[PDB]
């Protein structure tokens, strides 16, 4: 739709920051579209990933970090608040100890910090969605 996917934006995060995403899957859930949001330590896409969030719509969610080139311990969830064929609003809040992921206003996933959020320099949104809104909040010290 409005914003090109894969979408890449330089970013800084600390406690109280929020990344908000509005979009829509490009396929019905039977065809298993994916959505990926990655918080990178550098602008280059091969850089380390502080927080990797990957949805297989209708099936499962996986979260992980990539540290010095190597994926760490995968966290898997079968929580699936996304709705087949619907636009979604996704919010990722930086809390003191974890990321909190809200889907359409409802807390749906969390992920404890493995690397300080201050290491993030870039956010990338990719895979099988159209993206109409992307915002990183920058209001707090």
PDB file of N, CA, C and O in Angstrom, residues 6-87:
ATOM      1  N   UNK A   6      10.186  -4.469   1.686  1.00  0.00           N
ATOM      2  CA  UNK A   6      10.711  -4.250   3.034  1.00  0.00           C
ATOM      3  C   UNK A   6      10.931  -2.775   3.327  1.00  0.00           C
ATOM      4  O   UNK A   6      11.405  -2.015   2.468  1.00  0.00           O
ATOM      5  N   UNK A   7      10.563  -2.387   4.538  1.00  0.00           N
ATOM      6  CA  UNK A   7      10.640  -1.016   4.996  1.00  0.00           C
ATOM      7  C   UNK A   7      11.732  -0.917   6.051  1.00  0.00           C
ATOM      8  O   UNK A   7      11.750  -1.707   6.997  1.00  0.00           O
ATOM      9  N   UNK A   8      12.630   0.054   5.892  1.00  0.00           N
ATOM     10  CA  UNK A   8      13.792   0.214   6.759  1.00  0.00           C
ATOM     11  C   UNK A   8      13.841   1.653   7.238  1.00  0.00           C
ATOM     12  O   UNK A   8      13.780   2.577   6.420  1.00  0.00           O
ATOM     13  N   UNK A   9      13.964   1.851   8.544  1.00  0.00           N
ATOM     14  CA  UNK A   9      14.048   3.202   9.077  1.00  0.00           C
ATOM     15  C   UNK A   9      15.075   3.237  10.200  1.00  0.00           C
ATOM     16  O   UNK A   9      15.014   2.419  11.125  1.00  0.00           O
ATOM     17  N   UNK A  10      16.025   4.174  10.115  1.00  0.00           N
ATOM     18  CA  UNK A  10      16.920   4.386  11.244  1.00  0.00           C
ATOM     19  C   UNK A  10      16.081   4.674  12.479  1.00  0.00           C
ATOM     20  O   UNK A  10      15.005   5.267  12.385  1.00  0.00           O
ATOM     21  N   UNK A  11      16.547   4.213  13.642  1.00  0.00           N
ATOM     22  CA  UNK A  11      15.730   4.329  14.839  1.00  0.00           C
ATOM     23  C   UNK A  11      16.604   4.310  16.088  1.00  0.00           C
ATOM     24  O   UNK A  11      17.697   3.743  16.094  1.00  0.00           O
ATOM     25  N   UNK A  12      16.110   4.953  17.137  1.00  0.00           N
ATOM     26  CA  UNK A  12      16.690   4.846  18.469  1.00  0.00           C
ATOM     27  C   UNK A  12      15.582   4.481  19.433  1.00  0.00           C
ATOM     28  O   UNK A  12      14.459   4.981  19.312  1.00  0.00           O
ATOM     29  N   UNK A  13      15.915   3.633  20.397  1.00  0.00           N
ATOM     30  CA  UNK A  13      14.974   3.104  21.368  1.00  0.00           C
ATOM     31  C   UNK A  13      15.568   3.221  22.765  1.00  0.00           C
ATOM     32  O   UNK A  13      16.776   3.040  22.959  1.00  0.00           O
ATOM     33  N   UNK A  14      14.705   3.523  23.731  1.00  0.00           N
ATOM     34  CA  UNK A  14      15.000   3.382  25.150  1.00  0.00           C
ATOM     35  C   UNK A  14      13.672   3.165  25.857  1.00  0.00           C
ATOM     36  O   UNK A  14      12.612   3.182  25.225  1.00  0.00           O
ATOM     37  N   UNK A  15      13.729   2.955  27.174  1.00  0.00           N
ATOM     38  CA  UNK A  15      12.517   2.694  27.949  1.00  0.00           C
ATOM     39  C   UNK A  15      11.458   3.763  27.691  1.00  0.00           C
ATOM     40  O   UNK A  15      11.739   4.966  27.725  1.00  0.00           O
ATOM     41  N   UNK A  16      10.236   3.318  27.395  1.00  0.00           N
ATOM     42  CA  UNK A  16       9.163   4.218  27.039  1.00  0.00           C
ATOM     43  C   UNK A  16       8.968   4.433  25.548  1.00  0.00           C
ATOM     44  O   UNK A  16       7.927   4.962  25.147  1.00  0.00           O
ATOM     45  N   UNK A  17       9.939   4.049  24.718  1.00  0.00           N
ATOM     46  CA  UNK A  17       9.765   4.137  23.274  1.00  0.00           C
ATOM     47  C   UNK A  17       8.677   3.175  22.811  1.00  0.00           C
ATOM     48  O   UNK A  17       8.451   2.118  23.405  1.00  0.00           O
ATOM     49  N   UNK A  18       8.000   3.540  21.727  1.00  0.00           N
ATOM     50  CA  UNK A  18       7.007   2.651  21.141  1.00  0.00           C
ATOM     51  C   UNK A  18       7.144   2.682  19.628  1.00  0.00           C
ATOM     52  O   UNK A  18       7.273   3.758  19.037  1.00  0.00           O
ATOM     53  N   UNK A  19       7.124   1.498  19.018  1.00  0.00           N
ATOM     54  CA  UNK A  19       7.099   1.328  17.565  1.00  0.00           C
ATOM     55  C   UNK A  19       5.705   0.860  17.190  1.00  0.00           C
ATOM     56  O   UNK A  19       5.258  -0.195  17.658  1.00  0.00           O
ATOM     57  N   UNK A  20       5.007   1.642  16.369  1.00  0.00           N
ATOM     58  CA  UNK A  20       3.647   1.308  15.977  1.00  0.00           C
ATOM     59  C   UNK A  20       3.586   1.062  14.481  1.00  0.00           C
ATOM     60  O   UNK A  20       4.145   1.825  13.681  1.00  0.00           O
ATOM     61  N   UNK A  21       2.880   0.010  14.111  1.00  0.00           N
ATOM     62  CA  UNK A  21       2.822  -0.465  12.742  1.00  0.00           C
ATOM     63  C   UNK A  21       1.368  -0.754  12.423  1.00  0.00           C
ATOM     64  O   UNK A  21       0.684  -1.416  13.209  1.00  0.00           O
ATOM     65  N   UNK A  22       0.887  -0.255  11.288  1.00  0.00           N
ATOM     66  CA  UNK A  22      -0.421  -0.655  10.800  1.00  0.00           C
ATOM     67  C   UNK A  22      -0.261  -1.230   9.410  1.00  0.00           C
ATOM     68  O   UNK A  22       0.415  -0.638   8.557  1.00  0.00           O
ATOM     69  N   UNK A  23      -0.887  -2.374   9.189  1.00  0.00           N
ATOM     70  CA  UNK A  23      -0.747  -3.027   7.912  1.00  0.00           C
ATOM     71  C   UNK A  23      -1.785  -4.101   7.704  1.00  0.00           C
ATOM     72  O   UNK A  23      -2.694  -4.283   8.513  1.00  0.00           O
ATOM     73  N   UNK A  24      -1.627  -4.827   6.599  1.00  0.00           N
ATOM     74  CA  UNK A  24      -2.575  -5.871   6.271  1.00  0.00           C
ATOM     75  C   UNK A  24      -1.831  -7.010   5.591  1.00  0.00           C
ATOM     76  O   UNK A  24      -0.955  -6.748   4.758  1.00  0.00           O
ATOM     77  N   UNK A  25      -2.130  -8.264   5.936  1.00  0.00           N
ATOM     78  CA  UNK A  25      -1.483  -9.383   5.249  1.00  0.00           C
ATOM     79  C   UNK A  25      -1.851  -9.387   3.775  1.00  0.00           C
ATOM     80  O   UNK A  25      -2.959  -9.006   3.391  1.00  0.00           O
ATOM     81  N   UNK A  26      -0.908  -9.833   2.946  1.00  0.00           N
ATOM     82  CA  UNK A  26      -1.115  -9.896   1.502  1.00  0.00           C
ATOM     83  C   UNK A  26      -1.802 -11.174   1.039  1.00  0.00           C
ATOM     84  O   UNK A  26      -2.093 -11.293  -0.156  1.00  0.00           O
ATOM     85  N   UNK A  27      -2.048 -12.131   1.934  1.00  0.00           N
ATOM     86  CA  UNK A  27      -2.705 -13.382   1.567  1.00  0.00           C
ATOM     87  C   UNK A  27      -3.639 -13.802   2.688  1.00  0.00           C
ATOM     88  O   UNK A  27      -3.480 -13.395   3.846  1.00  0.00           O
ATOM     89  N   UNK A  28      -4.630 -14.621   2.328  1.00  0.00           N
ATOM     90  CA  UNK A  28      -5.464 -15.264   3.332  1.00  0.00           C
ATOM     91  C   UNK A  28      -4.607 -16.182   4.196  1.00  0.00           C
ATOM     92  O   UNK A  28      -3.537 -16.642   3.785  1.00  0.00           O
ATOM     93  N   UNK A  29      -5.087 -16.445   5.414  1.00  0.00           N
ATOM     94  CA  UNK A  29      -4.279 -17.189   6.374  1.00  0.00           C
ATOM     95  C   UNK A  29      -4.017 -18.621   5.906  1.00  0.00           C
ATOM     96  O   UNK A  29      -2.999 -19.216   6.277  1.00  0.00           O
ATOM     97  N   UNK A  30      -4.905 -19.183   5.079  1.00  0.00           N
ATOM     98  CA  UNK A  30      -4.688 -20.530   4.549  1.00  0.00           C
ATOM     99  C   UNK A  30      -3.377 -20.624   3.773  1.00  0.00           C
ATOM    100  O   UNK A  30      -2.736 -21.682   3.750  1.00  0.00           O
ATOM    101  N   UNK A  31      -2.955 -19.535   3.139  1.00  0.00           N
ATOM    102  CA  UNK A  31      -1.697 -19.519   2.413  1.00  0.00           C
ATOM    103  C   UNK A  31      -0.523 -19.073   3.287  1.00  0.00           C
ATOM    104  O   UNK A  31       0.586 -18.920   2.768  1.00  0.00           O
ATOM    105  N   UNK A  32      -0.754 -18.867   4.583  1.00  0.00           N
ATOM    106  CA  UNK A  32       0.311 -18.669   5.563  1.00  0.00           C
ATOM    107  C   UNK A  32       1.264 -17.521   5.213  1.00  0.00           C
ATOM    108  O   UNK A  32       2.473 -17.727   5.100  1.00  0.00           O
ATOM    109  N   UNK A  33       0.757 -16.297   5.074  1.00  0.00           N
ATOM    110  CA  UNK A  33       1.661 -15.152   4.921  1.00  0.00           C
ATOM    111  C   UNK A  33       2.426 -14.932   6.217  1.00  0.00           C
ATOM    112  O   UNK A  33       2.003 -15.349   7.295  1.00  0.00           O
ATOM    113  N   UNK A  34       3.583 -14.294   6.092  1.00  0.00           N
ATOM    114  CA  UNK A  34       4.436 -13.983   7.228  1.00  0.00           C
ATOM    115  C   UNK A  34       4.545 -12.476   7.401  1.00  0.00           C
ATOM    116  O   UNK A  34       4.299 -11.697   6.474  1.00  0.00           O
ATOM    117  N   UNK A  35       4.956 -12.081   8.601  1.00  0.00           N
ATOM    118  CA  UNK A  35       5.315 -10.712   8.916  1.00  0.00           C
ATOM    119  C   UNK A  35       6.552 -10.770   9.794  1.00  0.00           C
ATOM    120  O   UNK A  35       6.632 -11.598  10.707  1.00  0.00           O
ATOM    121  N   UNK A  36       7.527  -9.917   9.505  1.00  0.00           N
ATOM    122  CA  UNK A  36       8.744  -9.881  10.299  1.00  0.00           C
ATOM    123  C   UNK A  36       9.052  -8.443  10.673  1.00  0.00           C
ATOM    124  O   UNK A  36       8.989  -7.553   9.821  1.00  0.00           O
ATOM    125  N   UNK A  37       9.370  -8.221  11.946  1.00  0.00           N
ATOM    126  CA  UNK A  37       9.885  -6.946  12.438  1.00  0.00           C
ATOM    127  C   UNK A  37      11.200  -7.241  13.151  1.00  0.00           C
ATOM    128  O   UNK A  37      11.255  -8.123  14.015  1.00  0.00           O
ATOM    129  N   UNK A  38      12.263  -6.535  12.764  1.00  0.00           N
ATOM    130  CA  UNK A  38      13.592  -6.767  13.310  1.00  0.00           C
ATOM    131  C   UNK A  38      14.169  -5.446  13.797  1.00  0.00           C
ATOM    132  O   UNK A  38      14.157  -4.456  13.056  1.00  0.00           O
ATOM    133  N   UNK A  39      14.706  -5.448  15.015  1.00  0.00           N
ATOM    134  CA  UNK A  39      15.421  -4.300  15.577  1.00  0.00           C
ATOM    135  C   UNK A  39      16.919  -4.567  15.420  1.00  0.00           C
ATOM    136  O   UNK A  39      17.467  -5.434  16.108  1.00  0.00           O
ATOM    137  N   UNK A  40      17.574  -3.833  14.517  1.00  0.00           N
ATOM    138  CA  UNK A  40      18.965  -4.072  14.151  1.00  0.00           C
ATOM    139  C   UNK A  40      19.902  -3.118  14.893  1.00  0.00           C
ATOM    140  O   UNK A  40      19.521  -2.000  15.239  1.00  0.00           O
ATOM    141  N   UNK A  41      21.147  -3.562  15.093  1.00  0.00           N
ATOM    142  CA  UNK A  41      22.179  -2.738  15.716  1.00  0.00           C
ATOM    143  C   UNK A  41      22.891  -1.802  14.740  1.00  0.00           C
ATOM    144  O   UNK A  41      23.619  -0.910  15.196  1.00  0.00           O
ATOM    145  N   UNK A  42      22.740  -1.990  13.426  1.00  0.00           N
ATOM    146  CA  UNK A  42      23.336  -1.085  12.446  1.00  0.00           C
ATOM    147  C   UNK A  42      22.371  -0.925  11.279  1.00  0.00           C
ATOM    148  O   UNK A  42      21.393  -1.666  11.151  1.00  0.00           O
ATOM    149  N   UNK A  43      22.657   0.047  10.406  1.00  0.00           N
ATOM    150  CA  UNK A  43      21.780   0.247   9.258  1.00  0.00           C
ATOM    151  C   UNK A  43      21.859  -0.919   8.287  1.00  0.00           C
ATOM    152  O   UNK A  43      20.889  -1.190   7.577  1.00  0.00           O
ATOM    153  N   UNK A  44      22.991  -1.618   8.242  1.00  0.00           N
ATOM    154  CA  UNK A  44      23.146  -2.744   7.325  1.00  0.00           C
ATOM    155  C   UNK A  44      22.274  -3.920   7.758  1.00  0.00           C
ATOM    156  O   UNK A  44      22.208  -4.261   8.940  1.00  0.00           O
ATOM    157  N   UNK A  45      21.601  -4.549   6.787  1.00  0.00           N
ATOM    158  CA  UNK A  45      20.656  -5.615   7.108  1.00  0.00           C
ATOM    159  C   UNK A  45      21.332  -6.861   7.675  1.00  0.00           C
ATOM    160  O   UNK A  45      20.661  -7.673   8.320  1.00  0.00           O
ATOM    161  N   UNK A  46      22.634  -7.040   7.448  1.00  0.00           N
ATOM    162  CA  UNK A  46      23.320  -8.203   7.991  1.00  0.00           C
ATOM    163  C   UNK A  46      23.805  -7.977   9.416  1.00  0.00           C
ATOM    164  O   UNK A  46      24.372  -8.892  10.019  1.00  0.00           O
ATOM    165  N   UNK A  47      23.565  -6.795   9.977  1.00  0.00           N
ATOM    166  CA  UNK A  47      23.937  -6.518  11.352  1.00  0.00           C
ATOM    167  C   UNK A  47      23.107  -7.366  12.325  1.00  0.00           C
ATOM    168  O   UNK A  47      22.101  -7.983  11.962  1.00  0.00           O
ATOM    169  N   UNK A  48      23.550  -7.377  13.579  1.00  0.00           N
ATOM    170  CA  UNK A  48      22.915  -8.126  14.655  1.00  0.00           C
ATOM    171  C   UNK A  48      21.491  -7.645  14.910  1.00  0.00           C
ATOM    172  O   UNK A  48      21.121  -6.514  14.607  1.00  0.00           O
ATOM    173  N   UNK A  49      20.695  -8.521  15.507  1.00  0.00           N
ATOM    174  CA  UNK A  49      19.290  -8.258  15.736  1.00  0.00           C
ATOM    175  C   UNK A  49      19.037  -8.374  17.229  1.00  0.00           C
ATOM    176  O   UNK A  49      19.161  -9.457  17.814  1.00  0.00           O
ATOM    177  N   UNK A  50      18.704  -7.243  17.841  1.00  0.00           N
ATOM    178  CA  UNK A  50      18.375  -7.189  19.258  1.00  0.00           C
ATOM    179  C   UNK A  50      17.042  -7.877  19.525  1.00  0.00           C
ATOM    180  O   UNK A  50      16.849  -8.539  20.556  1.00  0.00           O
ATOM    181  N   UNK A  51      16.093  -7.718  18.608  1.00  0.00           N
ATOM    182  CA  UNK A  51      14.766  -8.294  18.772  1.00  0.00           C
ATOM    183  C   UNK A  51      14.261  -8.657  17.386  1.00  0.00           C
ATOM    184  O   UNK A  51      14.184  -7.790  16.513  1.00  0.00           O
ATOM    185  N   UNK A  52      13.943  -9.937  17.198  1.00  0.00           N
ATOM    186  CA  UNK A  52      13.440 -10.489  15.950  1.00  0.00           C
ATOM    187  C   UNK A  52      12.052 -11.028  16.255  1.00  0.00           C
ATOM    188  O   UNK A  52      11.897 -11.848  17.165  1.00  0.00           O
ATOM    189  N   UNK A  53      11.048 -10.533  15.535  1.00  0.00           N
ATOM    190  CA  UNK A  53       9.646 -10.871  15.758  1.00  0.00           C
ATOM    191  C   UNK A  53       9.079 -11.345  14.425  1.00  0.00           C
ATOM    192  O   UNK A  53       9.041 -10.569  13.469  1.00  0.00           O
ATOM    193  N   UNK A  54       8.665 -12.612  14.335  1.00  0.00           N
ATOM    194  CA  UNK A  54       8.211 -13.172  13.065  1.00  0.00           C
ATOM    195  C   UNK A  54       6.897 -13.911  13.262  1.00  0.00           C
ATOM    196  O   UNK A  54       6.846 -14.902  13.998  1.00  0.00           O
ATOM    197  N   UNK A  55       5.860 -13.452  12.571  1.00  0.00           N
ATOM    198  CA  UNK A  55       4.525 -14.027  12.651  1.00  0.00           C
ATOM    199  C   UNK A  55       4.303 -14.883  11.414  1.00  0.00           C
ATOM    200  O   UNK A  55       4.491 -14.409  10.288  1.00  0.00           O
ATOM    201  N   UNK A  56       3.902 -16.132  11.612  1.00  0.00           N
ATOM    202  CA  UNK A  56       3.288 -16.918  10.541  1.00  0.00           C
ATOM    203  C   UNK A  56       1.787 -16.848  10.785  1.00  0.00           C
ATOM    204  O   UNK A  56       1.271 -17.501  11.696  1.00  0.00           O
ATOM    205  N   UNK A  57       1.098 -15.998  10.013  1.00  0.00           N
ATOM    206  CA  UNK A  57      -0.292 -15.664  10.307  1.00  0.00           C
ATOM    207  C   UNK A  57      -1.147 -16.926  10.341  1.00  0.00           C
ATOM    208  O   UNK A  57      -1.119 -17.739   9.411  1.00  0.00           O
ATOM    209  N   UNK A  58      -1.888 -17.099  11.437  1.00  0.00           N
ATOM    210  CA  UNK A  58      -2.717 -18.271  11.630  1.00  0.00           C
ATOM    211  C   UNK A  58      -2.027 -19.465  12.260  1.00  0.00           C
ATOM    212  O   UNK A  58      -2.701 -20.453  12.573  1.00  0.00           O
ATOM    213  N   UNK A  59      -0.709 -19.416  12.464  1.00  0.00           N
ATOM    214  CA  UNK A  59       0.018 -20.585  12.957  1.00  0.00           C
ATOM    215  C   UNK A  59       0.772 -20.271  14.242  1.00  0.00           C
ATOM    216  O   UNK A  59       0.371 -20.737  15.311  1.00  0.00           O
ATOM    217  N   UNK A  60       1.849 -19.497  14.182  1.00  0.00           N
ATOM    218  CA  UNK A  60       2.691 -19.332  15.355  1.00  0.00           C
ATOM    219  C   UNK A  60       3.505 -18.055  15.204  1.00  0.00           C
ATOM    220  O   UNK A  60       3.571 -17.451  14.127  1.00  0.00           O
ATOM    221  N   UNK A  61       4.135 -17.666  16.302  1.00  0.00           N
ATOM    222  CA  UNK A  61       5.033 -16.523  16.338  1.00  0.00           C
ATOM    223  C   UNK A  61       6.348 -17.005  16.918  1.00  0.00           C
ATOM    224  O   UNK A  61       6.355 -17.802  17.864  1.00  0.00           O
ATOM    225  N   UNK A  62       7.458 -16.536  16.340  1.00  0.00           N
ATOM    226  CA  UNK A  62       8.784 -16.837  16.861  1.00  0.00           C
ATOM    227  C   UNK A  62       9.507 -15.529  17.139  1.00  0.00           C
ATOM    228  O   UNK A  62       9.342 -14.532  16.425  1.00  0.00           O
ATOM    229  N   UNK A  63      10.276 -15.524  18.224  1.00  0.00           N
ATOM    230  CA  UNK A  63      11.062 -14.370  18.617  1.00  0.00           C
ATOM    231  C   UNK A  63      12.463 -14.851  18.973  1.00  0.00           C
ATOM    232  O   UNK A  63      12.642 -15.980  19.444  1.00  0.00           O
ATOM    233  N   UNK A  64      13.459 -14.007  18.705  1.00  0.00           N
ATOM    234  CA  UNK A  64      14.852 -14.408  18.894  1.00  0.00           C
ATOM    235  C   UNK A  64      15.723 -13.162  18.829  1.00  0.00           C
ATOM    236  O   UNK A  64      15.232 -12.045  18.647  1.00  0.00           O
ATOM    237  N   UNK A  65      17.027 -13.365  19.020  1.00  0.00           N
ATOM    238  CA  UNK A  65      18.037 -12.350  18.767  1.00  0.00           C
ATOM    239  C   UNK A  65      19.115 -12.993  17.912  1.00  0.00           C
ATOM    240  O   UNK A  65      19.300 -14.212  17.938  1.00  0.00           O
ATOM    241  N   UNK A  66      19.821 -12.172  17.143  1.00  0.00           N
ATOM    242  CA  UNK A  66      20.987 -12.618  16.389  1.00  0.00           C
ATOM    243  C   UNK A  66      22.176 -11.823  16.907  1.00  0.00           C
ATOM    244  O   UNK A  66      22.230 -10.603  16.734  1.00  0.00           O
ATOM    245  N   UNK A  67      23.117 -12.509  17.549  1.00  0.00           N
ATOM    246  CA  UNK A  67      24.211 -11.869  18.269  1.00  0.00           C
ATOM    247  C   UNK A  67      25.521 -12.346  17.664  1.00  0.00           C
ATOM    248  O   UNK A  67      25.756 -13.556  17.567  1.00  0.00           O
ATOM    249  N   UNK A  68      26.344 -11.393  17.216  1.00  0.00           N
ATOM    250  CA  UNK A  68      27.584 -11.674  16.490  1.00  0.00           C
ATOM    251  C   UNK A  68      27.356 -12.721  15.400  1.00  0.00           C
ATOM    252  O   UNK A  68      28.098 -13.698  15.262  1.00  0.00           O
ATOM    253  N   UNK A  69      26.294 -12.514  14.622  1.00  0.00           N
ATOM    254  CA  UNK A  69      26.014 -13.353  13.481  1.00  0.00           C
ATOM    255  C   UNK A  69      25.232 -14.617  13.749  1.00  0.00           C
ATOM    256  O   UNK A  69      24.773 -15.245  12.789  1.00  0.00           O
ATOM    257  N   UNK A  70      25.036 -15.013  15.005  1.00  0.00           N
ATOM    258  CA  UNK A  70      24.435 -16.305  15.336  1.00  0.00           C
ATOM    259  C   UNK A  70      23.088 -16.127  16.029  1.00  0.00           C
ATOM    260  O   UNK A  70      22.986 -15.382  17.007  1.00  0.00           O
ATOM    261  N   UNK A  71      22.060 -16.830  15.537  1.00  0.00           N
ATOM    262  CA  UNK A  71      20.765 -16.830  16.217  1.00  0.00           C
ATOM    263  C   UNK A  71      20.893 -17.437  17.607  1.00  0.00           C
ATOM    264  O   UNK A  71      21.617 -18.416  17.808  1.00  0.00           O
ATOM    265  N   UNK A  72      20.186 -16.855  18.577  1.00  0.00           N
ATOM    266  CA  UNK A  72      20.240 -17.373  19.940  1.00  0.00           C
ATOM    267  C   UNK A  72      19.058 -18.300  20.195  1.00  0.00           C
ATOM    268  O   UNK A  72      18.614 -18.994  19.276  1.00  0.00           O
ATOM    269  N   UNK A  73      18.530 -18.316  21.418  1.00  0.00           N
ATOM    270  CA  UNK A  73      17.481 -19.273  21.765  1.00  0.00           C
ATOM    271  C   UNK A  73      16.119 -18.760  21.303  1.00  0.00           C
ATOM    272  O   UNK A  73      15.646 -17.713  21.764  1.00  0.00           O
ATOM    273  N   UNK A  74      15.494 -19.512  20.407  1.00  0.00           N
ATOM    274  CA  UNK A  74      14.196 -19.145  19.859  1.00  0.00           C
ATOM    275  C   UNK A  74      13.105 -19.262  20.916  1.00  0.00           C
ATOM    276  O   UNK A  74      13.090 -20.201  21.714  1.00  0.00           O
ATOM    277  N   UNK A  75      12.206 -18.279  20.940  1.00  0.00           N
ATOM    278  CA  UNK A  75      10.996 -18.320  21.756  1.00  0.00           C
ATOM    279  C   UNK A  75       9.818 -18.456  20.803  1.00  0.00           C
ATOM    280  O   UNK A  75       9.696 -17.676  19.852  1.00  0.00           O
ATOM    281  N   UNK A  76       8.966 -19.450  21.039  1.00  0.00           N
ATOM    282  CA  UNK A  76       7.833 -19.719  20.163  1.00  0.00           C
ATOM    283  C   UNK A  76       6.525 -19.578  20.923  1.00  0.00           C
ATOM    284  O   UNK A  76       6.402 -20.027  22.065  1.00  0.00           O
ATOM    285  N   UNK A  77       5.547 -18.964  20.272  1.00  0.00           N
ATOM    286  CA  UNK A  77       4.214 -18.790  20.821  1.00  0.00           C
ATOM    287  C   UNK A  77       3.186 -19.216  19.789  1.00  0.00           C
ATOM    288  O   UNK A  77       3.349 -18.961  18.588  1.00  0.00           O
ATOM    289  N   UNK A  78       2.122 -19.852  20.266  1.00  0.00           N
ATOM    290  CA  UNK A  78       0.954 -20.155  19.453  1.00  0.00           C
ATOM    291  C   UNK A  78      -0.180 -19.157  19.664  1.00  0.00           C
ATOM    292  O   UNK A  78      -1.256 -19.334  19.090  1.00  0.00           O
ATOM    293  N   UNK A  79       0.037 -18.113  20.461  1.00  0.00           N
ATOM    294  CA  UNK A  79      -0.956 -17.055  20.589  1.00  0.00           C
ATOM    295  C   UNK A  79      -1.145 -16.374  19.244  1.00  0.00           C
ATOM    296  O   UNK A  79      -0.173 -15.983  18.594  1.00  0.00           O
ATOM    297  N   UNK A  80      -2.391 -16.233  18.816  1.00  0.00           N
ATOM    298  CA  UNK A  80      -2.697 -15.767  17.463  1.00  0.00           C
ATOM    299  C   UNK A  80      -3.891 -14.827  17.498  1.00  0.00           C
ATOM    300  O   UNK A  80      -5.007 -15.200  17.131  1.00  0.00           O
ATOM    301  N   UNK A  81      -3.686 -13.581  17.929  1.00  0.00           N
ATOM    302  CA  UNK A  81      -4.785 -12.607  17.927  1.00  0.00           C
ATOM    303  C   UNK A  81      -5.075 -11.990  16.567  1.00  0.00           C
ATOM    304  O   UNK A  81      -6.101 -11.310  16.433  1.00  0.00           O
ATOM    305  N   UNK A  82      -4.205 -12.168  15.573  1.00  0.00           N
ATOM    306  CA  UNK A  82      -4.467 -11.610  14.255  1.00  0.00           C
ATOM    307  C   UNK A  82      -5.682 -12.280  13.618  1.00  0.00           C
ATOM    308  O   UNK A  82      -5.935 -13.474  13.812  1.00  0.00           O
ATOM    309  N   UNK A  83      -6.421 -11.502  12.828  1.00  0.00           N
ATOM    310  CA  UNK A  83      -7.667 -11.951  12.213  1.00  0.00           C
ATOM    311  C   UNK A  83      -7.498 -12.076  10.705  1.00  0.00           C
ATOM    312  O   UNK A  83      -7.013 -11.148  10.048  1.00  0.00           O
ATOM    313  N   UNK A  84      -7.932 -13.215  10.165  1.00  0.00           N
ATOM    314  CA  UNK A  84      -7.830 -13.500   8.737  1.00  0.00           C
ATOM    315  C   UNK A  84      -8.419 -12.365   7.902  1.00  0.00           C
ATOM    316  O   UNK A  84      -9.558 -11.944   8.117  1.00  0.00           O
ATOM    317  N   UNK A  85      -7.616 -11.851   6.970  1.00  0.00           N
ATOM    318  CA  UNK A  85      -8.042 -10.838   6.026  1.00  0.00           C
ATOM    319  C   UNK A  85      -8.252  -9.447   6.582  1.00  0.00           C
ATOM    320  O   UNK A  85      -8.803  -8.594   5.882  1.00  0.00           O
ATOM    321  N   UNK A  86      -7.831  -9.172   7.807  1.00  0.00           N
ATOM    322  CA  UNK A  86      -8.111  -7.882   8.416  1.00  0.00           C
ATOM    323  C   UNK A  86      -6.845  -7.044   8.539  1.00  0.00           C
ATOM    324  O   UNK A  86      -5.738  -7.570   8.679  1.00  0.00           O
ATOM    325  N   UNK A  87      -7.020  -5.730   8.470  1.00  0.00           N
ATOM    326  CA  UNK A  87      -5.958  -4.820   8.857  1.00  0.00           C
ATOM    327  C   UNK A  87      -5.680  -4.990  10.344  1.00  0.00           C
ATOM    328  O   UNK A  87      -6.585  -5.278  11.126  1.00  0.00           O
TER     329      UNK A  87
END
